[PDB]
Design a protein around this ligand. Structure first.
Ligand SMILES: CC(C)CCC[C@@H](C)[C@H]1CC[C@H]2[C@@H]3CC=C4C[C@@H](O)CC[C@]4(C)[C@H]3CC[C@]12C
Ligand SMILES: CC(C)CCC[C@@H](C)[C@H]1CC[C@H]2[C@@H]3CC=C4C[C@@H](O)CC[C@]4(C)[C@H]3CC[C@]12C
Ligand SMILES: CC(C)CCC[C@@H](C)[C@H]1CC[C@H]2[C@@H]3CC=C4C[C@@H](O)CC[C@]4(C)[C@H]3CC[C@]12C
Ligand SMILES: CC(C)CCC[C@@H](C)[C@H]1CC[C@H]2[C@@H]3CC=C4C[C@@H](O)CC[C@]4(C)[C@H]3CC[C@]12C
Ligand SMILES: CC(C)CCC[C@@H](C)[C@H]1CC[C@H]2[C@@H]3CC=C4C[C@@H](O)CC[C@]4(C)[C@H]3CC[C@]12C
Ligand SMILES: CC(C)CCC[C@@H](C)[C@H]1CC[C@H]2[C@@H]3CC=C4C[C@@H](O)CC[C@]4(C)[C@H]3CC[C@]12C
Ligand SMILES: CC(C)CCC[C@@H](C)[C@H]1CC[C@H]2[C@@H]3CC=C4C[C@@H](O)CC[C@]4(C)[C@H]3CC[C@]12C
Ligand SMILES: CC(C)CCC[C@@H](C)[C@H]1CC[C@H]2[C@@H]3CC=C4C[C@@H](O)CC[C@]4(C)[C@H]3CC[C@]12C
Ligand SMILES: CC(C)CCC[C@@H](C)[C@H]1CC[C@H]2[C@@H]3CC=C4C[C@@H](O)CC[C@]4(C)[C@H]3CC[C@]12C
Ligand SMILES: CC(C)CCC[C@@H](C)[C@H]1CC[C@H]2[C@@H]3CC=C4C[C@@H](O)CC[C@]4(C)[C@H]3CC[C@]12C
Ligand SMILES: CC(C)CCC[C@@H](C)[C@H]1CC[C@H]2[C@@H]3CC=C4C[C@@H](O)CC[C@]4(C)[C@H]3CC[C@]12C
Ligand SMILES: CC(C)CCC[C@@H](C)[C@H]1CC[C@H]2[C@@H]3CC=C4C[C@@H](O)CC[C@]4(C)[C@H]3CC[C@]12C
Ligand SMILES: CC(C)CCC[C@@H](C)[C@H]1CC[C@H]2[C@@H]3CC=C4C[C@@H](O)CC[C@]4(C)[C@H]3CC[C@]12C
Ligand SMILES: CC(C)CCC[C@@H](C)[C@H]1CC[C@H]2[C@@H]3CC=C4C[C@@H](O)CC[C@]4(C)[C@H]3CC[C@]12C
Ligand SMILES: CC(C)CCC[C@@H](C)[C@H]1CC[C@H]2[C@@H]3CC=C4C[C@@H](O)CC[C@]4(C)[C@H]3CC[C@]12C
Ligand SMILES: CC(C)CCC[C@@H](C)[C@H]1CC[C@H]2[C@@H]3CC=C4C[C@@H](O)CC[C@]4(C)[C@H]3CC[C@]12C
Ligand SMILES: CC(C)CCC[C@@H](C)[C@H]1CC[C@H]2[C@@H]3CC=C4C[C@@H](O)CC[C@]4(C)[C@H]3CC[C@]12C
Ligand SMILES: CC(C)CCC[C@@H](C)[C@H]1CC[C@H]2[C@@H]3CC=C4C[C@@H](O)CC[C@]4(C)[C@H]3CC[C@]12C
Ligand SMILES: CC(C)CCC[C@@H](C)[C@H]1CC[C@H]2[C@@H]3CC=C4C[C@@H](O)CC[C@]4(C)[C@H]3CC[C@]12C
Ligand SMILES: CC(C)CCC[C@@H](C)[C@H]1CC[C@H]2[C@@H]3CC=C4C[C@@H](O)CC[C@]4(C)[C@H]3CC[C@]12C
Lengths: 280, 280, 280, 280
């Protein structure tokens, strides 16, 4: 039996737009400046800069989308139907593309350090062609469900832009797929690559070969640190869905609020990328 | 139908005076020392020092005004009528002068970096004459409404020093004007100048030409960061005024409290300026 | 008409002992090590070390006293009458001696910088003889009221070790005296000395003459920063006592809790001194 | 008369698993990498590395145990009886082994600094043989009570994996023993060794002999700082047990919540060790 009394808190209606607007401004300015400096001009000296440019493009699209999130968080979504689908589409594109870009950065680091003897053609070919196919096509393929399912439906004057499925089985399947492709699958690749790099990092002593990984590792740990609590919340909610953590109706509201605040902090990570790009 | 039950919380009556007193002490000491070192003696080597001196003068006047704010925040305003007008006048003068001084600093940086070939007479003339007219006269012109409208009126033993207008149309018009002249109009100029500087900052390599902007950019970002949440709150309240975010009487109190605390943190920025002047 | 319903919160009964115990350990270890290194051995190279040794002795005595505070904060004071007087005596001695030691440090800095031409005998004589008389005798003279007035009296099984006076006039007079001799009187001397030093610090350029003040100024600002909120709270309470801020019975409890927590943070400063002594 | 209404808060059921999962990931990765770099390869240049390897092994075992804690914190313990005993066994092993390893590090530092004249054979023999016996055997001997007493018992559908004793005398005796062997006994040894080192550290001037203690002292202070509040909470609870702090039924719940959160932060220390190992 579904519960009731689900509504947004008064403090949240003012706290969330502040976060969204700060992320709006910071992300737009930083990503635009990074794109202008890197792509338009000639500043790509290393191979990580191209992946960082892809990251900047995805983050710029998402932060452009954000003001609709900020407006919706206050009162409601009652300004169209196609805009809900569009917002969900860029959301999913950025969400599934940033992690794959990070995994490609880790793979490039592994190929550059472990097989430094003769590997420049593999790195170049992988970089160009595989980043295009591997990092983008799957993002669109996972946005495919967004076109079909995203919609806005009112329920006694309650207009919500929310993905709707005929049954809860679709809900749990898609949440588990989100977890698997967002955290577990690329996390294993990143961990394996960096562990092998660390094991092989026992030649001569500290040098540029040892200090070249600092920026990449800081970026990766920051990206995953701002995302972990949201993943924990959604995993707990999905477990509640399959009659495993049945504990009453007062747990679902708490986990939902956890999910919302942690989504806001993930968008904070989306802004945190160019900030890391500033310090150098 | 206007709501009721508007009163200050017991915790606020002790939290606000603490912030006001800390700002009192820090701002007075720092601004006085900066004025004494810079104006009275001969320590103006660069051109940013004169604008910083103007900023120090404005902040010193505001922090001198502050103890009346601290006294009012506790119980009430029942110690005159002309003092309310005076307090509002220096408040508005500082509020509309600091942003214009920052915009002039940004303009000077743009003229110094982009057109470094032959530009010293434009910088000197602009600095002196335009800072006087452009940065001050408009501040007084925007304090003009304060003389007319600021007043203290009791309502069943409720003495409030608050600007009063015949209709809410004046309220929304003046709030929108405050937003436009405080955040949007100078922010665009600052962003354009610094973006053009960044685009043109691609000659030779890192040097004093690249490290001269650090203090100015830190000052500007700090100034705007301590002000953004207050602007978000007032924008939301103004939207509530024009029957757009009608959501009940429990949202207005929350946004009012948001506005108060964020005003206190803005005064914290007013103190944060000389602190930035200390580290060097 | 005095109000009722005055009792300690359940969370406070566990929060306060934690702070007291942390301060116990840190202060005892740091002050003991500082005394052992400085007094017993020969490590006094400068003239600030002797004043710092006096500060260490006073702080060591206070932190030795602290566990009685920690025990009292939990349940009650029912383990004697002479111990209450003793605890109040060392409390007052440390409280009125630390500020005077800081003022003497500031005076020594002023004499060392402004009159560096011929001043070593004034500094030595002042240091020894005036620190003894000026910094100690007045502390005992202000502890004189503690012997007379400190006592423990039960009121329906409520044993409180609290200073008792026949009238509230004594209460307000002694609170105002505490404020005047704790913050205003030495603060003016410190501010005047450092302002004159800053005005006279315009010879040659940055050197040891400019970097010798860093530790002293950091110590002084930390000392006053951990104390300001408590002084604000007691000033507000004293004003409530003289029928000035009459606002109901719900303000006194809030200001009392403010006073308690801020006292704990002041003891945190008492521990913060040797920590500043560690970094160098 | 025992009280009632003991249950976990809804917010705790989501806050605790987040901490447990973060500690899971960070501890496993860091400790595994440290073990792989140090033990498997040849990177033990100093004598502190062996004790740090022992610490890493113990922390790795505990963080492996942790996911059962995370699962239990949500709903209940209803997935066995032998697993409760096992979890308690590794918990106690790590808890009583980390402090002894720290004490051995302090003893090695004392022997290396105070008796640097002729002491290499004592350090080697002590290191190997005494770390094995002294640091391990007692840990197992103190886990001996865990085998006997750890159990899961339901009480009206309340399955709790909790140590059970016939009387409260056993409870207070074992809590006092835990405090004595966890904080007081090794703390005295560490303090004595470091105080004697500081007293003897008055030869020549600052050098490697003075900078070799930084990492060890930082590790020790961090270890004890993340543990002190939990010890304060358990001491207060044990005092409540022996009819000393009888203050009602509303104090026990608060101290229990204090204990839980502080346990989580102690596990945070368990993760903080390899982080300290990263910065160098
Ligand atoms: C409050 C908001 C507007 C502040 C924005 C702060 C961030 C986003 C700004 C401040 C400093 C800026 C960076 C400063 C320097 C560089 C290095 C250059 O090679 C690329 C541009 C880049 C990377 C800028 C990106 C945008 C940037 C990071
Ligand atoms: C049809 C719907 C799904 C469109 C949404 C996806 C769009 C926004 C994506 C898909 C392919 C993407 C492009 C793929 C490759 C490049 C080249 C790179 O150097 C900069 C980014 C850029 C130019 C991307 C921009 C964003 C992009 C156009
Ligand atoms: C000065 C800057 C920060 C303003 C830009 C931030 C914008 C995007 C945010 C701040 C507060 C938000 C407003 C508050 C929420 C609503 C409710 C909706 O019924 C009308 C749109 C409206 C009124 C929002 C528009 C977007 C908004 C104004
Ligand atoms: C998800 C919500 C709670 C936001 C969390 C943001 C925090 C947890 C993230 C964002 C920025 C991150 C930090 C970015 C920079 C540094 C300094 C570097 O030398 C170590 C990593 C460290 C210390 C990161 C730790 C994790 C971090 C602090
Ligand atoms: C473990 C530490 C080091 C990282 C930070 C974890 C905790 C402290 C942070 C991360 C996410 C944060 C939570 C985000 C979501 C919620 C739920 C909401 O209803 C209250 C705020 C609250 C409760 C925040 C409390 C603090 C929080 C849980
Ligand atoms: C608690 C309160 C009183 C502390 C005040 C702290 C601030 C305001 C003080 C502490 C250090 C001081 C600065 C220290 C050094 C300089 C550099 C000199 O070229 C101008 C004076 C100036 C700029 C001082 C300004 C005031 C200052 C910034
Ligand atoms: C009539 C009412 C509005 C008066 C309020 C505005 C007053 C306080 C303002 C207006 C003009 C201002 C002056 C304009 C220019 C200078 C020169 C500069 O090197 C230091 C500040 C100083 C000296 C300003 C001090 C403050 C000032 C006198
Ligand atoms: C450290 C102190 C002395 C610096 C200045 C403190 C001031 C700002 C503090 C301390 C004394 C306090 C004031 C004393 C006088 C009054 C008048 C009364 O009707 C309202 C309370 C009020 C307004 C108090 C508010 C807070 C207050 C003004
Ligand atoms: C408005 C209320 C919440 C006060 C907010 C104050 C905060 C948000 C402001 C005040 C001081 C500011 C900081 C001042 C100094 C630094 C260090 C510099 O290297 C980067 C900018 C940074 C990091 C600023 C970030 C924004 C900042 C932290
Ligand atoms: C987005 C981050 C990085 C910058 C800080 C934004 C938030 C966390 C800060 C800035 C302004 C702060 C708020 C200022 C005003 C209010 C409303 C008041 O009723 C409760 C305090 C509260 C709620 C503060 C909570 C935290 C706050 C919102
Ligand atoms: C948790 C508790 C026990 C930690 C105690 C930390 C503080 C008090 C300890 C840690 C480092 C110690 C300092 C380290 C170095 C010095 C410099 C020497 O010339 C005098 C001793 C002195 C000044 C020590 C004083 C005590 C000290 C500051
Ligand atoms: C009778 C009551 C009030 C006694 C309480 C005050 C006692 C504890 C005070 C008063 C005089 C003080 C002494 C005065 C001078 C010195 C010399 C100095 O190099 C170290 C501290 C030392 C040794 C002080 C120790 C503490 C002291 C003995
Ligand atoms: C292990 C370390 C931290 C213990 C030392 C801290 C001591 C001083 C603190 C911690 C908690 C405090 C206890 C809690 C409060 C009471 C109530 C009183 O009716 C008996 C004394 C007693 C029981 C306190 C004794 C002092 C105490 C134990
Ligand atoms: C009274 C309660 C709230 C405790 C307050 C403690 C705070 C406010 C105090 C204690 C320690 C102090 C800091 C100690 C060290 C530094 C770093 C130095 O480069 C500038 C001063 C600064 C930044 C001090 C600021 C004030 C400070 C942060
Ligand atoms: C102004 C800033 C920079 C310095 C810190 C000031 C404020 C934020 C700090 C200093 C003292 C702190 C207060 C100490 C006393 C109280 C009263 C108690 O019932 C709740 C905790 C509370 C409310 C603390 C809240 C935060 C606090 C007021
Ligand atoms: C979010 C999680 C996965 C991040 C894990 C961060 C910590 C545990 C990682 C990040 C940096 C890593 C360290 C980086 C460098 C070294 C030095 C080498 O001589 C041993 C491995 C060691 C000691 C690594 C241990 C594990 C480590 C400390
Ligand atoms: C029977 C029960 C109690 C077993 C639980 C204790 C186990 C896990 C403990 C007891 C003895 C321990 C070993 C003792 C010594 C060493 C050698 C050292 O270089 C690495 C750790 C290692 C290899 C330990 C691993 C963990 C260990 C096997
Ligand atoms: C994506 C990563 C963070 C997941 C790994 C964290 C794991 C160990 C944590 C996160 C939340 C926890 C879940 C929440 C609590 C329960 C209740 C129990 O009735 C079933 C197990 C289950 C469902 C837990 C399994 C362990 C769990 C999933
Ligand atoms: C028990 C719960 C509250 C967790 C507490 C964690 C805090 C108190 C611990 C964990 C990490 C520790 C810090 C680790 C690193 C440093 C920097 C070093 O130069 C001084 C010690 C210092 C400053 C430690 C202070 C104590 C510390 C901050
Ligand atoms: C003394 C300072 C410097 C170190 C940190 C001590 C305090 C502030 C920290 C350490 C442990 C923390 C507490 C851990 C446990 C509890 C009890 C729970 O019901 C509320 C959270 C609360 C209340 C935390 C509040 C803050 C806390 C007490």
């Amino acid at each position: 039996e579904p519960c009731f009394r689900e509504e947004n808190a008064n403090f949240n209606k003012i706290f969330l737009p502040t976060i969204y607007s700060i992320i709006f401004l910071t992300g737009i300015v930083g990503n635009g400046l990074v794109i202008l400096v890197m792509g338009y001009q000639k500043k790509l000296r290393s191979m990580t800069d191209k992946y960082r440019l892809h990251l900047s493009v995805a983050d710029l699209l998402f932060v452009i989308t954000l003001p609709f999130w900020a407006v919706d968080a206050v009162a409601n979504w009652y300004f169209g139907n196609f805009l809900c689908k569009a917002v969900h589409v860029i959301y999913t594109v950025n969400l599934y593309s940033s992690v794959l870009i990070l995994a490609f950065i880790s793979l490039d680091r592994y190929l550059a350090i472990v097989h430094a003897t003769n590997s420049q053609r593999p790195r170049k070919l992988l970089a160009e062609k595989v980043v295009y196919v591997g990092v983008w096509i799957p993002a669109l393929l996972l946005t495919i469900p967004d076109f079909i399912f995203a919609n806005v439906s009112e329920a006694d004057d309650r207009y919500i832009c929310d993905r709707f499925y005929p049954n809860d089985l679709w809900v749990v399947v898609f949440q588990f797929q989100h977890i698997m492709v967002g955290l577990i699958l690329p996390g294993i690749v990143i961990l394996s690559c960096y562990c092998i790099i660390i094991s092989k990092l026992s030649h001569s002593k500290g040098h540029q070969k040892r200090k070249a990984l600092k920026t990449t590792v800081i970026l990766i740990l920051a990206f995953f640190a701002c995302w972990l609590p949201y993943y924990i919340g959604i995993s707990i909610d999905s477990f509640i869905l399959l009659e495993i953590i049945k504990q009453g109706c007062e747990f679902e509201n708490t986990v939902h609020k956890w999910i919302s605040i942690t989504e806001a902090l993930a968008f904070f990570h989306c802004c945190l990328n160019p900030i890391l790009y500033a310090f150098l």
